[PDB]
Amino acid sequence: MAEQQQEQQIRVRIPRKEENEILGIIEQMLGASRVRVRCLDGKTRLGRIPGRLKNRIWVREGDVVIVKPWEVQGDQKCDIIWRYTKTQVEWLKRKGYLDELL
């Protein structure tokens, strides 16, 4: 219900989802091309970013990210996307509260 120049889109509803994805928040101040994420949808993984995002994320401490699952074992690897409050992570987070209560 909005089509004008300079508009913030939700960017939600992402395609490609054979086994669904997990949602976690990233943390890391050192900055060694890798970060640590904790996620809902039952997952705990180390998140990695591409060279372009690596020099464009500059995460300080307390950011939200979407993660991909890597193998299983007693710890999973994940491919993460960094963003500070937008709509995609807000959607999955709202779903977490819905499942818990409400």
Domains and CATH numbers, the chain: 1-102 (2.40.50.140)
- How many other C-beta atoms can be found within 10 angstroms of the C-beta atom of residue 41? 15
Experimental method: NMR
Query: What's the half-sphere exposure (Cβ side, CA atoms, 13 Å) at 76?
Result: 21
| Residue 80 tokens, joined | 């993460």
**Which of 89, 92, 96, 88 lies closest to 12 in space, CA to CA?**
88
**Which residue's structure tokens are 């950011």?**
63
| Residue 48 tokens, joined | 């990695």
Q: What are the DSSP calls for 30-51, one per residue?
A: S-SSEEEEEEETTEEEEEE--H
| Residue 70 tokens, joined | 């890597």
**Secondary element (H or E) of residue 65:** strand 63-67
Q: Is 16 helix (H, G, I), strand (E, B) or coil?
A: coil
